[PDB]
Design an enzyme around this catalytic site. Structure first.
Site, PDB file in Angstrom:
ATOM      1  N   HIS B  41       0.815  -1.221   0.000  1.00  0.00           N
ATOM      2  CA  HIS B  41       0.000   0.000   0.000  1.00  0.00           C
ATOM      3  C   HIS B  41       0.859   1.286   0.000  1.00  0.00           C
ATOM      4  O   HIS B  41       0.310   2.363  -0.156  1.00  0.00           O
ATOM      5  CB  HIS B  41      -1.081   0.012   1.102  1.00  0.00           C
ATOM      6  CG  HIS B  41      -0.558   0.165   2.486  1.00  0.00           C
ATOM      7  ND1 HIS B  41      -0.549  -0.897   3.367  1.00  0.00           N
ATOM      8  CD2 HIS B  41      -0.145   1.275   3.138  1.00  0.00           C
ATOM      9  CE1 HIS B  41      -0.071  -0.415   4.509  1.00  0.00           C
ATOM     10  NE2 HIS B  41       0.177   0.887   4.421  1.00  0.00           N
ATOM     11  N   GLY B 143       2.321   5.719   9.475  1.00  0.00           N
ATOM     12  CA  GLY B 143       3.761   5.685   9.246  1.00  0.00           C
ATOM     13  C   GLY B 143       4.431   4.429   9.794  1.00  0.00           C
ATOM     14  O   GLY B 143       5.531   4.070   9.357  1.00  0.00           O
ATOM     15  N   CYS B 145       3.420   1.379   9.339  1.00  0.00           N
ATOM     16  CA  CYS B 145       3.285   0.230   8.434  1.00  0.00           C
ATOM     17  C   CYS B 145       4.673  -0.223   7.939  1.00  0.00           C
ATOM     18  O   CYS B 145       5.572   0.610   7.776  1.00  0.00           O
ATOM     19  CB  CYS B 145       2.335   0.545   7.285  1.00  0.00           C
ATOM     20  SG  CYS B 145       0.658   0.959   7.830  1.00  0.00           S
TER      21      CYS B 145
HETATM   22  C1  LIG Z   1      -3.353   4.791   9.690  1.00  0.00           C
HETATM   23  C2  LIG Z   1      -2.751   3.542  10.285  1.00  0.00           C
HETATM   24  C3  LIG Z   1      -2.464   3.471  11.641  1.00  0.00           C
HETATM   25  C4  LIG Z   1      -1.976   2.294  12.174  1.00  0.00           C
HETATM   26  N1  LIG Z   1      -1.747   1.191  11.452  1.00  0.00           N
HETATM   27  C5  LIG Z   1      -2.006   1.251  10.141  1.00  0.00           C
HETATM   28  C6  LIG Z   1      -2.505   2.392   9.510  1.00  0.00           C
HETATM   29  N2  LIG Z   1      -2.755   2.425   8.120  1.00  0.00           N
HETATM   30  C7  LIG Z   1      -3.715   1.760   7.452  1.00  0.00           C
HETATM   31  O1  LIG Z   1      -4.564   1.052   7.986  1.00  0.00           O
HETATM   32  C8  LIG Z   1      -3.638   1.935   5.952  1.00  0.00           C
HETATM   33  C9  LIG Z   1      -4.469   0.927   5.120  1.00  0.00           C
HETATM   34  C10 LIG Z   1      -5.972   1.142   4.911  1.00  0.00           C
HETATM   35  C11 LIG Z   1      -6.102   1.230   3.399  1.00  0.00           C
HETATM   36  C12 LIG Z   1      -5.094   0.235   2.857  1.00  0.00           C
HETATM   37  C13 LIG Z   1      -3.938   0.318   3.854  1.00  0.00           C
HETATM   38  C14 LIG Z   1      -4.043  -0.504   5.110  1.00  0.00           C
END
Ligand SMILES: Cc1ccncc1NC(=O)C[C@@]12CCC[C@@H]1C2
Ligand SMILES: Cc1ccncc1NC(=O)C[C@@]12CCC[C@@H]1C2
Lengths: 304, 304
Positions: B41, B143, B145
């Site tokens: 992503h 951030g 991820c």
């Molecule tokens: C904002 C955040 C905070 C903590 N851990 C993860 C995230 N980010 C997400 O969930 C992004 C997405 C949703 C759309 C595809 C992609 C996985």
């Protein structure tokens, strides 16, 4: 989102861990620059432990009796000295992995990470608090002496704790990196009184703010209180008296969430007086006191 | 003595953390040998997030669009590919800090340490469990991820988790290092059902043994039970059914302490039916399920 009892990354400290042997005893040492620091009780035998004459025991030891091993390599000891309850072994090689560092004396109620080691090897890392009575409720077995406590501000490691002893009660005691014990403890195998402990109020409040930020809100109520009224409740429940300095440190959290510190104090007061009623806050069924207001801001914002 | 929620030392993993940027998005990557792994992503923009066409988005990207930075140095990207929900960026330089490693798919109920990172930089390390429903209750902000979960057997790092997503409920979801999600989750910004969770029974039992070893004994009673009787209680209290395989894994702890597994099951049964009665076990006011029997033996013996 989510709130965890996070420890600092231990990498910078792992590169400083060495093994120190003197006679039959092996414990951990901290290698920084050309000096290895370790608890002075590495020079004792079981007969000495009740009341060791440290100065006398050290006099029977020479540089060559302290075996220092950084995993694969043997360090050459060119000097030895005792400063308070620590031994400083001067080695001929500076640790190439030495990070930027400081030796600090933390205050009771402050938190830090411990890198538990055995025979100079790291087994794990956990976050803990220096109790108001200067003890730490850690996880230390025989051989873990010399394992250190620390904090990290960007790239600088502030070493605050070195592990020395397990009290008859299974609570832990240690020193700063200049060998001064936190609390009234002495490095002897004797029963020693630890002071009356209290719950670190400012930390519980900081944790209540972390809970609100992350979704746990059930404990918020229609009430407020005063420092005096709250301190009467804190007195009854053996909590540290809250001061304006503690209110001041909680400022950023009060600002972020819009919940006045005294209003959060009122939520804490009702939780002390009524309990959790079988409910949880951030995965806990008790009031957590091992997160400082600084820990909460750092974790809630992503400070690396 | 003392029992703590200990994480593995994160040093070996810190040396693998890099920053990956593609367009406006920056997240973390894992640099092992000459390959950087990161959630796919990283190639999306907010318009894509509801239902990204990953194959289509990746086609608009070239090796030079993936900016990979290992703190101070920029890595040269010579290849890119998507395997399931991860991107593998082939770089021209092998990570000099690559430890011995394996990519493993953990089972639900197993534990691991997470090295939370932001912009390729480590902020902290915590121990957690893969829930029976394949979610993790972690601490992840935007951030984070690409931050990974792992275990360490002596000198070999087994990478089991890569963080991808926070569900609308604030629980976390991710993949193994081949990009396969744990659980039914898809990397889309949509509401997604997580299965009904249960408490990891074998882990609670392992933690009750750790409690006995370390002094907390109040919950031991005059009773015993059977797998069938116990599983009826576990059913009512949404606990994982206990099997002979779980009894088998608890063998070393049963052997060390002399407390038959079914006798410990009877203590757990009374704690489920009566609660803690305002008391604590190893500093907790609830039944902890984030310590496997393996974690208990390792910590109680000093395995480094
Ligand atoms: C904002 C955040 C905070 C903590 N851990 C993860 C995230 N980010 C997400 O969930 C992004 C997405 C949703 C759309 C595809 C992609 C996985
Ligand atoms: C056995 C152990 C386990 C965990 N933490 C520490 C220890 N060791 C000690 O307490 C040794 C002594 C007592 C005599 C002087 C010296 C401090």
């Amino acid at each position: 989102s989510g709130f965890r009892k996070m420890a600092f990354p231990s990498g910078k400290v792992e590169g400083c861990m060495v093994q120190v042997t003197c006679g039959t005893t092996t414990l951990n040492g901290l290698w920084l620059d050309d000096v290895v620091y370790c608890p002075r009780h590495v020079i004792c035998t079981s007969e000495d432990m009740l009341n060791p004459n440290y100065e006398d025991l050290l006099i029977r030891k020479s540089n060559h009796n302290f075996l220092v091993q950084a995993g694969n390599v043997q360090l050459r000891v060119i000097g030895h000295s005792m400063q308070n309850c620590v031994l400083k072994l001067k080695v001929d090689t500076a640790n190439p992995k030495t990070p930027k560092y400081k030796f600090v004396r933390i205050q009771p109620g402050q938190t830090f990470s411990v890198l538990a080691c055995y025979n100079g090897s790291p087994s794990g890392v956990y976050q803990c608090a220096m109790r108001p009575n200067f003890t730490i409720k850690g996880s230390f077995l025989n051989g873990s002496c010399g394992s250190v406590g620390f904090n990290i501000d960007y790239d600088c490691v502030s070493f605050c704790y070195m592990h020395h002893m397990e009290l008859p009660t299974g609570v832990h005691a240690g020193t700063d990196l200049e060998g001064n014990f936190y609390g009234p403890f002495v490095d002897r195998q004797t029963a020693q009184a630890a002071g009356t402990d209290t719950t670190i109020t400012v930390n519980v409040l900081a944790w209540l703010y972390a809970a609100v930020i992350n979704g746990d809100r059930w404990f918020l109520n229609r009430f407020t209180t005063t420092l005096n009224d709250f301190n009467l409740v804190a007195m009854k429940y053996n909590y540290e008296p809250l001061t304006q300095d503690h209110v001041d440190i909680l400022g950023p959290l009060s600002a972020q969430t819009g919940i006045a510190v005294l209003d959060m104090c009122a939520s804490l007061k009702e939780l002390l007086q009524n309990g959790m009623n079988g409910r949880t806050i951030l995965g806990s069924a008790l009031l957590e006191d091992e997160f400082t207001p600084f820990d909460v801001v750092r974790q809630c914002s992503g400070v690396t």
